[PDB]
Design an enzyme around this catalytic site. Structure first.
Site, PDB file in Angstrom:
ATOM      1  N   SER A 125      -7.533  -8.844   0.272  1.00 48.58           N
ATOM      2  CA  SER A 125      -8.992  -8.202  -0.104  1.00 48.58           C
ATOM      3  C   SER A 125      -8.964  -7.853  -1.296  1.00 48.58           C
ATOM      4  O   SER A 125     -10.375  -7.078  -2.111  1.00 48.58           O
ATOM      5  CB  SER A 125      -9.464  -7.826   0.915  1.00 48.58           C
ATOM      6  OG  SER A 125      -8.927  -6.132   1.641  1.00 48.58           O
ATOM      7  N   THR A 171      -8.714  -5.868   5.117  1.00 49.02           N
ATOM      8  CA  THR A 171      -9.515  -4.659   5.605  1.00 49.02           C
ATOM      9  C   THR A 171      -9.498  -4.069   4.181  1.00 49.02           C
ATOM     10  O   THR A 171     -10.705  -3.185   3.720  1.00 49.02           O
ATOM     11  CB  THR A 171      -8.847  -3.657   6.735  1.00 49.02           C
ATOM     12  OG1 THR A 171      -7.437  -3.053   5.699  1.00 49.02           O
ATOM     13  CG2 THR A 171      -8.513  -4.305   7.909  1.00 49.02           C
ATOM     14  N   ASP A 172      -8.893  -3.802   2.958  1.00 50.64           N
ATOM     15  CA  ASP A 172      -8.925  -3.157   2.130  1.00 50.64           C
ATOM     16  C   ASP A 172      -9.874  -2.980   1.406  1.00 50.64           C
ATOM     17  O   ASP A 172     -11.067  -2.116   0.606  1.00 50.64           O
ATOM     18  CB  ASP A 172      -7.934  -3.319   0.709  1.00 50.64           C
ATOM     19  CG  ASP A 172      -6.539  -3.427   1.359  1.00 50.64           C
ATOM     20  OD1 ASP A 172      -6.683  -2.239   2.216  1.00 50.64           O
ATOM     21  OD2 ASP A 172      -5.292  -3.863   0.479  1.00 50.64           O
ATOM     22  N   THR A 175      -4.268  -9.156   5.788  1.00 50.64           N
ATOM     23  CA  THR A 175      -3.409  -9.013   6.325  1.00 50.64           C
ATOM     24  C   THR A 175      -3.100 -10.027   8.195  1.00 50.64           C
ATOM     25  O   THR A 175      -2.493  -9.789   8.611  1.00 50.64           O
ATOM     26  CB  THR A 175      -3.351  -7.372   6.863  1.00 50.64           C
ATOM     27  OG1 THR A 175      -2.945  -6.807   5.719  1.00 50.64           O
ATOM     28  CG2 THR A 175      -2.050  -7.201   7.981  1.00 50.64           C
TER      29      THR A 175
HETATM   30  N1  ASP Z   1      -3.891  -4.795   1.762  1.00 52.30           N
HETATM   31  C1  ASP Z   1      -4.486  -6.067   2.820  1.00 52.30           C
HETATM   32  C2  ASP Z   1      -4.763  -4.916   3.958  1.00 52.30           C
HETATM   33  C3  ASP Z   1      -4.908  -5.929   5.152  1.00 52.30           C
HETATM   34  O1  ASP Z   1      -5.772  -6.528   5.824  1.00 52.30           O
HETATM   35  O2  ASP Z   1      -5.081  -4.842   6.640  1.00 52.30           O
HETATM   36  C4  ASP Z   1      -5.849  -6.456   2.524  1.00 52.30           C
HETATM   37  O3  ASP Z   1      -6.451  -5.801   2.700  1.00 52.30           O
HETATM   38  O4  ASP Z   1      -5.701  -8.027   2.752  1.00 52.30           O
END
Ligand code: ASP
Lengths: 127, 182
Positions: B52, B83-84, B11
């Site tokens: 991720s 973050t995932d 993200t």
């Molecule tokens: N779906 C995203 C969530 C994020 O990065 O905040 C990822 O992990 O790539």
């Protein structure tokens, strides 16, 4: 390096654990309740584990976010120990599963995998 | 002095175009949109540019190798990540890269560096400040905190304070331009 992580719920049976081992899964993590343990009645779960625990690593962690696991705290825990369940201690769920995958990446001796999961490798665990 | 910035996507690198389509910035552009002027003598290295959620265990072997070949060349490494699965990676790297000679800091953001009120500037500023400390090992920087990478979990899904150190003290927390111990 294929690992299955299944969440303990009331009445869950060992059926799907036999299936995983048949499917070639080399390790299993169970997310238990609270400080950890296994039901001794209501399902074949405990007998299923007392069986497969000697064949693949079976790790127990907690569904709760903080404070981790202690299988000595309750009889439900102590039984899981006797059945050959490996406690995850105060490890995060992310640490518990990657630690397992990494170990299975160069060994399959359940009894060895078990001493390893209970040792503080990189600051992940209080041992 | 010398910082390496490895990009994996997420993200933090996100940009939505005028159409269902989704584009990714490189790690160099992220830093610059985040408005980081500080970072000097900083190299960039874009390993991946994915969400991720797509991360596989093989992706970790790639990252490990890269890091193992750069740890002697640098004083600090930062890895931007979605973050995932950020905490999955940080944990796994901690096992693979046994004894790191330098701080390796994983960070990301809940809000793309693109947008306003993004948490990207704070996260990166924090990662960089810790990448230049003396403190070797694998860490997550998020919401102003530095956490041991193998004790970090994603605890929130729609909220700036997304990561916590579980049953382990925070390594450092931001406080102005000063990183404070716990
Ligand atoms: N779906 C995203 C969530 C994020 O990065 O905040 C990822 O992990 O790539």
């Amino acid at each position: 390096m294929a690992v299955l992580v299944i969440k303990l719920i009331p009445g869950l049976s060992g059926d799907i654990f036999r299936a995983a081992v048949e499917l070639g899964y080399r390790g299993i993590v169970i997310e238990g309740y609270g400080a950890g343990g296994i039901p001794y009645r209501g399902s074949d779960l405990l007998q299923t584990i007392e069986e497969l625990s000697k064949e693949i690593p079976i790790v127990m962690t907690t569904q709760a976010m903080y404070d981790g696991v202690d299988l000595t705290r309750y009889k439900v825990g102590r039984l899981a120990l006797r059945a050959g369940v490996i406690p995850a201690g105060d490890m995060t769920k992310e640490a518990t599963v990657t630690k397992l995958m990494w170990i299975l990446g160069h060994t399959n001796n359940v009894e060895e995998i078990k001493v390893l999961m209970r040792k503080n490798l990189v600051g992940e665990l209080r041992d | 002095m010398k910082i390496l910035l490895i990009g994996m996507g997420g993200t933090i690198a996100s940009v939505k175009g005028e159409n269902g389509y989704e584009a990714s910035l490189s790690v160099k552009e992220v830093l610059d949109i985040a408005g980081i002027k500080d970072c000097e003598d900083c190299d960039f290295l874009d390993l991946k540019n994915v969400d991720s959620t797509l991360i596989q265990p093989e992706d970790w072997v790639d990252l490990a190798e890269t890091l193992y070949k750069n740890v002697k060349k640098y004083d600090g490494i930062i890895v931007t990540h979605g973050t995932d699965t950020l905490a999955y990676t940080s944990s796994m790297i901690s096992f693979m890269l046994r004894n790191p000679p330098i701080p390796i800091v994983f960070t990301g953001s809940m809000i793309p560096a693109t947008e306003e009120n993004s948490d990207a500037p704070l996260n990166l500023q924090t990662a960089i400040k810790f990448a230049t400390s003396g403190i070797r090992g694998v860490y997550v920087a998020f919401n102003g905190k530095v956490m041991l990478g193998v004790r970090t979990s994603k605890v929130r899904t729609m909220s700036r304070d997304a990561f916590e150190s579980i049953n382990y003290p925070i390594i450092a927390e931001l406080r102005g331009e000063d990183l404070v111990v716990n």
